[PDB]
Paper text:
The crystal structure of A. vinelandii flavodoxin II was solved at 1.17 Å resolution by molecular replacement using the model of the Cys69Ala mutant of A. vinelandii flavodoxin II (PDB ID 1YOB19). Following refinement (with statistics presented in Supporting Information Table S2), the root mean square displacements between the wildtype and Cys69Ala variant are 0.45 Å and 0.97 Å based on superpositions of the Cα and all atoms, respectively. No phosphodiester modification was observed in the structure, as has been reported previously to be present in A. vinelandii flavodoxin II;22, 23, 24, 25, 26 perhaps reflecting strain variations or differences in growth conditions. The Azotobacter flavodoxin II also has an insertion of eight amino acid residues (amino acids 64–71) near the FMN cofactor that is generally found in nitrogenase‐associated flavodoxins; these residues have been proposed to be involved in complex formation with the Fe‐protein of nitrogenase. In wildtype flavodoxin II, the Cys69 side chain points toward the interior of the protein near the FMN cofactor, so that formation of a disulfide‐bridged flavodoxin II dimer would require repositioning of this loop. The SG of Cys69 is in van der Waals contact (3.51 Å) with the CD1 methyl group of Leu57, and the presence of this non‐covalent interaction is likely reflected in the variations in the positioning of the FMN and residues 57–60 observed in this region between the wildtype and mutant structures. On reduction to the semiquinone state, the amide bond flips such that the carbonyl is placed in an “O‐up” conformation that is able to hydrogen bond with the protonated N5 position of FMN. The ambiguous electron density for the peptide bond between Gly58‐Glu59, as well as weak density for the side chain of Glu59 in the wildtype flavodoxin II structure [Fig. 3(D)], is indicative of a mixture of conformations that could not be cleanly resolved into components such as cis “O‐down,” trans “O‐down” and trans “O‐up” conformations for a Clostridial flavodoxin. Given the yellow color of the crystals, it is very likely that they exhibit an oxidized state, but the presence of some residual reduced forms from the anaerobic purification and/or photoreduction in the X‐ray beam cannot be dismissed due to weak electron density for Gly58‐Glu59.
Author numbering: 1 to 179
Write the structure that this text describes.
Amino acid sequence: AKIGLFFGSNTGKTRKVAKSIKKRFDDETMSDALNVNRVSAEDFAQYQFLILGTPTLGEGELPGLSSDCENESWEEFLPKIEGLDFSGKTVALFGLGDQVGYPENYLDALGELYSFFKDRGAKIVGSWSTDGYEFESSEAVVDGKFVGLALDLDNQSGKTDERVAAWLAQIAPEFGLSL
Ligand SMILES: Cc1cc2nc3c(=O)[nH]c(=O)nc-3n(C[C@H](O)[C@H](O)[C@H](O)COP(=O)(O)O)c2cc1C
Ligand SMILES: [Mg+2]
Ligand SMILES: [Mg+2]
Ligand SMILES: [Mg+2]
């Protein structure tokens, strides 16, 4: 497939969102939603286009064993790919979090993922307005916008599909999407 769709998850919400993205696209356009704990670095590296999802867990951390997840996740995956260059590749990110429960750390892990790929040369697309969210601080906010799609399936699950649909339309020119 042209676009690799990868996520990490501990209670399945990020997996559900990822599947809700893939259901919109055919198998030449997009890979099935793949948990990073099941992907090799070489397979991840094949894709010139990536859509990457993560929750924020612990407090402000990527999913993985150190944030008390059942299985390894993004925490243990990033070192496997940290020596790779993402220049010329296009990346869009989505984050899940709980803006009420974690008002000072909402979507922090989305910011960590953004930084990882930006520092390694990726072209990142898909920034998102902070309107309609209530929070105090987020490492995912850069220049007044979230660095990727912001979701909240604890407080705003009924907004997810509309948000995903609008975000996909926004990134469609960069990802060569037909909706
Ligand atoms: C122990 C724990 C810690 C969390 N920490 C944060 C946090 O720091 N920031 C945030 O935005 N959301 C936080 N959340 C909310 C989760 O990211 C949110 O519930 C998400 O939907 C979980 O996704 P998953 O089912 O894919 O694991 C936390 C949730 C739990 C259970
Ligand atoms: Mg097609
Ligand atoms: Mg297949
Ligand atoms: Mg190493």
